[PDB]
Design a protein around this ligand. Sequence first.
Ligand SMILES: [Mg+2]
Ligand SMILES: [Mg+2]
Ligand SMILES: [Mg+2]
Ligand SMILES: [Mg+2]
Ligand SMILES: [Mg+2]
Ligand SMILES: [Mg+2]
Ligand SMILES: [Mg+2]
Ligand SMILES: [Mg+2]
Ligand SMILES: [Mg+2]
Ligand SMILES: [Mg+2]
Ligand SMILES: [Mg+2]
Ligand SMILES: [Mg+2]
Ligand SMILES: [Mg+2]
Ligand SMILES: [Mg+2]
Ligand SMILES: [Mg+2]
Ligand SMILES: [Mg+2]
Ligand SMILES: [Mg+2]
Ligand SMILES: [Zn+2]
Lengths: 127, 25, 214, 97, 63
Amino acid sequence: SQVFGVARIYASFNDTFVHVTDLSGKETIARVTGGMKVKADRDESSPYAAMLAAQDVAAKCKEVGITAVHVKIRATGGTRTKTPGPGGQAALRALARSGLRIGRIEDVTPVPSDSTRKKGGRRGRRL
Amino acid sequence: MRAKWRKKRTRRLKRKRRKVRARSK
Amino acid sequence: VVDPFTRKEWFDIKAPSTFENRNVGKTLVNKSTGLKSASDALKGRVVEVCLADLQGSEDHSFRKIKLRVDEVQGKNLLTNFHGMDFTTDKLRSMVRKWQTLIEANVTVKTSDDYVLRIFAIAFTRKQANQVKRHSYAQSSHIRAIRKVISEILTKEVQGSTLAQLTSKLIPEVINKEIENATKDIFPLQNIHVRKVKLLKQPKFDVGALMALHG
Amino acid sequence: PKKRASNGRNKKGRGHVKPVRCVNCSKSIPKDKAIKRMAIRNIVEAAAVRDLSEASVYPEYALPKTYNKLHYCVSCAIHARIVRVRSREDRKNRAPP
Amino acid sequence: TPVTLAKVIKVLGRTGSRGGVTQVRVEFLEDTSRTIVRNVKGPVRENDILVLMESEREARRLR
RNA sequence: GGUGAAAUUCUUGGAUUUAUUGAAGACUAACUACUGCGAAAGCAUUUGCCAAGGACGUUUUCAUUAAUCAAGAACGAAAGUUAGGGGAUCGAAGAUGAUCAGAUACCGUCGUAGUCUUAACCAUAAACUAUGCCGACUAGGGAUCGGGUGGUGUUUUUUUAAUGACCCACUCGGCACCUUACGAGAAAUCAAAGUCUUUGGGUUCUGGGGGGAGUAUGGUCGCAAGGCUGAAACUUAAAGGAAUUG
RNA sequence: AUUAUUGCUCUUCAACGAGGAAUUCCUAGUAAGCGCAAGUCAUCAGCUUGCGUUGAUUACGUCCCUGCCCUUUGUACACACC
Ligand SMILES: [Mg+2]
Ligand SMILES: [Mg+2]
Ligand SMILES: [Mg+2]
Ligand SMILES: [Mg+2]
Ligand SMILES: [Mg+2]
Ligand SMILES: [Mg+2]
Ligand SMILES: [Mg+2]
Ligand SMILES: [Mg+2]
Ligand SMILES: [Mg+2]
Ligand SMILES: [Mg+2]
Ligand SMILES: [Mg+2]
Ligand SMILES: [Mg+2]
Ligand SMILES: [Mg+2]
Ligand SMILES: [Mg+2]
Ligand SMILES: [Mg+2]
Ligand SMILES: [Mg+2]
Ligand SMILES: [Mg+2]
Ligand SMILES: [Zn+2]
């Protein structure tokens, strides 16, 4: 009923990424992060900035042509944390409350058949 | 001092007396 | 001082034959300029869409599909096939403790000579009166299940390209025959092809490609 | 003296398992000594569930949880997660809740 | 401007780390047969009457 | 980007995010457990091949062929050494941003050796159950892995079986847990750490207050680093174990 | 009685226009306002100890802050973390 695209939300710690693209992926449209919509470096990942970034994203989305979208939220992944960051659910909340539509949302965090030694060495990051 | 460091302490000490004695062979 | 959206050409994506809505989605390119154009440059992309999103029913909510774009004809961009996946959450939902994950795979060819590697996964189930709390099989068990699973897969392929293989996957007949050959060894549950990743296409051949459309 | 019969933690008839890397500090720690939590939770959250359903195509959709195994390192297990510290006796209790 | 009145039934208890806030269940008189839990700031007893400025958003824990 | 917070750093070179396809080396996630196997070190993707093994079944065979072991030998985590290959990752060293009174560190960045593999070395780990091996006896209980036996057990449908997975009883042999304690202990505890002043089943090995010291010396092994063997003079009234109350 | 003990009279007529960061005390005849007696005292209360007079607002809760107490737990401390 609507026009569909991809939301794709990389929500790590220390920042949260949102950017809508073509459903094929190649051509992307409107981005902006949390590190953008406030300056404080340490406040780069708080749900507040994430919301404000979902605001800017929704604004251009409904300014170019996308009326709907599917989200693929995503943590750092790889050999790192693997657990969803602070400002993705808030970005989700803010982009649904925007006025855009929503349909089907799977997670795409890279999970390995494990390996490549994790950083920080055997004795652990100790502090 | 930690035992392992003391074990290392004398390893060094030994390798030295190994040197000095060698000047005299 | 430009804003490429007052410059972008706009598009819509059409599915192939053996599904539901061929009208799948929309996209953006660039005006077919002399020297780098909207045609040959791209279009030949791929599209991730749940087949429950393109079949209609939800007894299909997992099982994802990759449509690849081969031929185009102005505003009407036609697609074929790139493979099939699984929703990451659905898989994670079957990998319960106290049971066996059995997994097997095989690389094989069709008539219209596409080469593919297809997958297959099953888990042992408790006997519906079992008392012991886990239920694992016995490796000699497992080995049997794989050799049979593979015996079944190498059969079901080399049908009429993916085209009929496609038409074989969608109603999951493979899943049941598996269960059939198997139940003479061990229980088992879920049992899906899970993944199938294509990987070698023959030649363009504008005939058969177009032959899936109308 | 000896503080536990599981010694550190749970390995009898093997002599070597295989280190996992701690999820919180990256410390290596034997798999069988790991301390492990299956963190399952909805992709959305508390209050977002209404807002999510409403601003969507589909009848109530489906909804998928996130399934994540968690490997803490003991010090990390103690500094936050499952830990307290228990009396000489209550230690012996392997029952979860 | 919609007014929505609800009669307090059962005092639930204190939340908010400070504790000034009191949880409570109500039943609106304008069409009864429907309960909601609210958060209050003032002192409250049973049968007191609360003005729900909006009529549908109940809460829980408070930090 | 990173952190408690930052900075060093990277960004007209469209970074970071995205998409499609490609290369390299390492690894084997989830399933994975008070679960398996091996002399121990150790061993988790598939399939082919090559030989090996325990337990079980056994009205088979041989018939004392055995138990344990100075000397001697095979294997031996990680690191490290020699000569090639490899060199993705993480990363002793070094260099750096910060922190600090200082900060040779902890945290951050760059990253040499290394990490992987072949052919040789090395022989040590809290190499741990801090508990030698064979044999007998002594007490309860529910789980579980392998094997076997029993049942007009359940389930699979076809036409009933035959299979297969499952349920109950039993029995060898495993990995363990539970409860008691006759019994043992300085206690913590322990089905052995029991069957010990009512002191003897067989055998190997090590210890004899604490330091000095695993040091000196000699011998021997090693390319080296170092391994094995290993004293004394002198010093000293404690050092140490378990439990109790603060 | 000077470096003015205190009291009185005329004159002189300052800062201070509700107070930053912070911080104190308090739940009923209490808080706050208001004086008085007593101690000291030859003379000197802007101090104290008590006293009555006028008389509220706001909680009747919790563990956020701060402080302490209790259990569990580690200890090589027991002249006991100085
Ligand atoms: Mg710490
Ligand atoms: Mg000379
Ligand atoms: Mg002690
Ligand atoms: Mg201790
Ligand atoms: Mg070991
Ligand atoms: Mg695997
Ligand atoms: Mg390297
Ligand atoms: Mg340095
Ligand atoms: Mg410096
Ligand atoms: Mg240095
Ligand atoms: Mg030794
Ligand atoms: Mg051990
Ligand atoms: Mg027994
Ligand atoms: Mg039987
Ligand atoms: Mg004590
Ligand atoms: Mg007086
Ligand atoms: Mg005074
Ligand atoms: Zn940790």
